[PDB]
Write a protein that binds this ligand. Structure first.
Ligand SMILES: *[C@@H]1O[C@H](CO)[C@@H](O[C@@H]2O[C@H](CO)[C@@H](O)[C@H](O)[C@H]2NC(C)=O)[C@H](O)[C@H]1NC(C)=O
Ligand SMILES: *[C@@H]1O[C@H](CO)[C@@H](O)[C@H](O)[C@H]1NC(C)=O
Ligand SMILES: *[C@@H]1O[C@H](CO)[C@@H](O)[C@H](O)[C@H]1NC(C)=O
Ligand SMILES: *[C@@H]1O[C@H](CO)[C@@H](O)[C@H](O)[C@H]1NC(C)=O
Ligand SMILES: *[C@@H]1O[C@H](CO)[C@@H](O)[C@H](O)[C@H]1NC(C)=O
Ligand SMILES: *[C@@H]1O[C@H](CO)[C@@H](O)[C@H](O)[C@H]1NC(C)=O
Ligand SMILES: *[C@@H]1O[C@H](CO)[C@@H](O)[C@H](O)[C@H]1NC(C)=O
Ligand SMILES: [Fe+3]
Length: 507
């Protein structure tokens, strides 16, 4: 395996396999997505980190959702939010209480169906030892049968330059197909201590409110529907399917474009904002869309490609303050995640997030950002160290893992493929607006919008589904491994790199 200490590697493109169709969504008859509890018993149980290893969130839903007809939102105050926890399964002597809420998905158009959720609960457990296994039960102890089985998770290790989570899984754009189950099975077999999910979770917005789905909403329904519809039960199916993972392994989610889910009154992000726990208060972002947290000696920043990222905005000011608080002798690694890649070389979404790069890249570079993880593009790509489109030994490694297995088409065409360079005005993200993607003025592609071969800042690209694992070893070395779904033999690795940071050179 190469090391970033060797400098940039000559670009590699893996030849395409013959297309075998789109991934197939799990049906609503799959036992893993059906309601397996009754009454107010907890379902969709999920653990999330707090800003520091000494606290964590436990979340769950009680009660079935309502889809269609005259939905009647539940009163969240009718079911309590209690977690009992402890260091042994038979001694759950600690107790925490939390908050409950519901959300709805409402469309004021004739023929469209409305949805309202079960009661969602979020409870923060305080006073946890780092690096330690906690057993817990959640629910409402005053309702017979309304407590979960005993589950367990391990807190992140203590913050320090020699203290790291063993394995961090990174995925994006999962959806809920049979290929998603392959990604999640591969990931779970690698026993990660933490899962990062870089947006585009359930793909509920590939469905009409009446349950009909498509591989491409724009292709199918963009002209024949009054709004970009969703089928919200796909979120519940996803949460139920994922429970064996999320109830035992902390999972940190950040939003992608498929979470927009616009509804009545121009309300957006309702499901995303309600369903997951985020360390928004603890990291002082006060937003579900971006936040930070420490996991051992790693300071993680989750940024919002779909909230104002301009230099004059709230997110940028929060980011400046967050970075200024980082002590690189305590957390040597600075790692970021967000939905939209800045250096993807696929035709799909080429240069789409350029305005976010122009806004934020220099700030992150000035603080020595080590690694960036993104999703969005349905393929795998790893960059050489790069800053402002220039190979740079102090630039971040950008890795894109939006290849989680959702039913939309794989990204296969490259912008540098003959005749495939998109027209510049077609590239910017419409939801966020702006145009920042000008033709290059230096380097091999000077005067053009694209290269005519794989750009030298792209180390490796492959159109396969999969997931990655980050193994930070010490304050200067981390091992990254990406695994393709179609390889199932023990120890298979699709791409790997030793990432070596040089603080005396770059900070
Ligand atoms: C930091 O971690 C790296 C990777 O585990 C260590 O590098 C290894 O050190 C051993 C002993 O010298 C070698 O056999 C391996 O070949 C090294 N791997 C690589 C990629 O270089 C490194 O020693 C550690 N640095 C510390 C603990 O200060
Ligand atoms: C769905 O909710 C909206 C907003 O309350 C309402 O206008 C609409 O009539 C509802 N549709 C149905 C079928 O109840
Ligand atoms: C998705 O899963 C199906 C069925 O297991 C498989 O045939 C197909 O090759 C997978 N798609 C990719 C891109 O791996
Ligand atoms: C849902 O509505 C669309 C048209 O809006 C229709 O083509 C589709 O067949 C419907 N699906 C069901 C299950 O009714
Ligand atoms: C509608 O919602 C989105 C997301 O908040 C926002 O960007 C947009 O400006 C809003 N449009 C109007 C007319 O308010
Ligand atoms: C990035 O490169 C362009 C073109 O060379 C330059 O004008 C711009 O100032 C650079 N941005 C930063 C933050 O250096
Ligand atoms: C930018 O490059 C494209 C080809 O990639 C070319 O068609 C276009 O005319 C160029 N625009 C400018 C202002 O140079
Ligand atoms: Fe996306």
């Amino acid at each position: 395996p190469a090391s970033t200490l060797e400098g940039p590697s000559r670009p590699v493109t893996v030849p395409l396999r013959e297309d075998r169709g789109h991934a197939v969504d799990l049906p609503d008859t799959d036992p893993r997505v059906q309601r397996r509890v009754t009454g107010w018993a907890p379902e969709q149980i999920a653990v999330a980190l707090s800003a520091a290893p000494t606290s964590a969130w436990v979340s769950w839903i009680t009660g079935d959702f309502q889809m269609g007809g005259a939905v009647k939102p539940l009163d969240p105050g009718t079911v309590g939010s209690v977690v009992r926890y402890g260091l042994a399964a038979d001694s759950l002597v600690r107790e925490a209480t939390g908050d409950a809420l519901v959300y709805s998905q409402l469309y004021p158009f004739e023929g469209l169906q409305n949805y309202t959720s079960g009661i969602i609960h979020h409870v923060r457990l305080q006073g946890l030892e780092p690096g330690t296994k906690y057993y817990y039960q959640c629910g409402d102890p005053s309702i017979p049968g309304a407590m979960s089985a005993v589950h367990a998770f391990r807190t992140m290790p203590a913050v320090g330059p020699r203290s790291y989570p063993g394995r961090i899984a990174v995925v994006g754009d999962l959806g809920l197909t049979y290929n998603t189950t392959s990604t999640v099975e591969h990931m779970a077999s690698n026993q990660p201590d933490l899962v990062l999910l870089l947006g585009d979770v359930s793909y509920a917005n590939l469905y009409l409110t009446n349950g009909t789905g498509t591989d491409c909403y724009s292709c199918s329904f963009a002209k024949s529907t009054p709004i970009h519809e969703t089928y919200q039960p796909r979120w519940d199916y996803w949460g139920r399917y994922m429970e064996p993972v999320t109830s035992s392994t902390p999972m940190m989610v950040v939003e992608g474009n498929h979470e927009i889910e616009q509804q009545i009154g121009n309300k957006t992000f309702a499901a995303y904002s309600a369903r997951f726990a985020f360390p928004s208060m603890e990291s002082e972002s006060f937003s579900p869309f971006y936040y930070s947290f420490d996991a051992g000696g790693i300071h993680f920043i989750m940024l919002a490609a779909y909230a104002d990222y301009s230099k004059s905005g709230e997110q940028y000011r929060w980011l400046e303050k967050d970075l200024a608080k980082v002590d690189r002798s305590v957390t040597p690694w600075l790692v970021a995640g967000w939905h939209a890649p800045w250096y993807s070389t696929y035709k799909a979404h080429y240069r789409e997030a350029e305005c976010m790069r122009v806004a934020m890249e220099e700030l992150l570079y000035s603080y020595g950002l080590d690694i960036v993880f993104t999703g969005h593009v349905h393929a795998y790509e790893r960059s050489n160290r790069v800053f402002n489109y220039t190979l740079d030994p102090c630039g971040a490694v950008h890795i894109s893992v939006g290849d989680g297995g959702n039913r939309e088409k794989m990204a296969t065409t490259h912008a540098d493929d003959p005749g495939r360079c998109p027209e510049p005005m077609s590239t910017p993200d419409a939801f966020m607006g702006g145009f920042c993607a000008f033709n290059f003025t230096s380097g091999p592609a000077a005067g053009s919008f694209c290269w005519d071969r794989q750009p030298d800042y792209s180390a490796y690209r492959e159109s396969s589904f999969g997931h990655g694992i980050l193994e930070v070893k010490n304050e200067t070395h981390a091992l990254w491994k990406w695994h393709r779904n179609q390889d199932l033999y023990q120890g298979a690795v699709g791409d790997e790199i030793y990432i070596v940071r040089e603080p005396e050179r770059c900070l």
